[PDB]
Design a protein around this ligand. Sequence first.
Ligand SMILES: OC[C@H]1O[C@H](Sc2cccc(Cl)c2)[C@H](O)[C@@H](n2cc(-c3cc(F)c(F)c(F)c3)nn2)[C@H]1O
Ligand SMILES: [Cl-]
Length: 138
Amino acid sequence: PLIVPYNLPLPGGVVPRMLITILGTVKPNANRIALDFQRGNDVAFHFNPRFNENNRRVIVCNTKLDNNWGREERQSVFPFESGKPFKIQVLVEPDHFKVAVNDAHLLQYNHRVKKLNEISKLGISGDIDLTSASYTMI
Ligand SMILES: OC[C@H]1O[C@H](Sc2cccc(Cl)c2)[C@H](O)[C@@H](n2cc(-c3cc(F)c(F)c(F)c3)nn2)[C@H]1O
Ligand SMILES: [Cl-]
């Protein structure tokens, strides 16, 4: 397994048609997972499954600019399961990141950070065993 937190460089930044695939297994009794597409210290796209936020399971998405979180976008479809293997696919489209989990579309996140070429690393953190993280062009 890859060591978490894991940094996946995205050479030259992201571009439409870039597909990121993450395979892992959620730990038993998991609390949180995060993907952070970063532009330097800024987080262009934070994707954050929370397994127990006031006894609800929710995915929180946001952007961090100059150390300030913005407006949260929340999704109650929650496809992660403690103890179970998952696949996350993040497809960069021209106007949003498009996320599917276990082959089912989950959400889209409109680009707030518009210098896509400067979003040149992906951090993967939280309560998973990380099997692989890679990218390809579709
Ligand atoms: O809005 C999104 C933000 O919400 C609050 S801050 C907040 C509170 C209220 C309103 C607003 Cl707008 C913001 C989180 O504390 C923020 N977070 C989570 C993690 C984190 C770190 C890990 F190492 C990890 F493994 C993991 F899964 C998550 N780091 N930072 C973030 O999720
Ligand atoms: Cl969290």
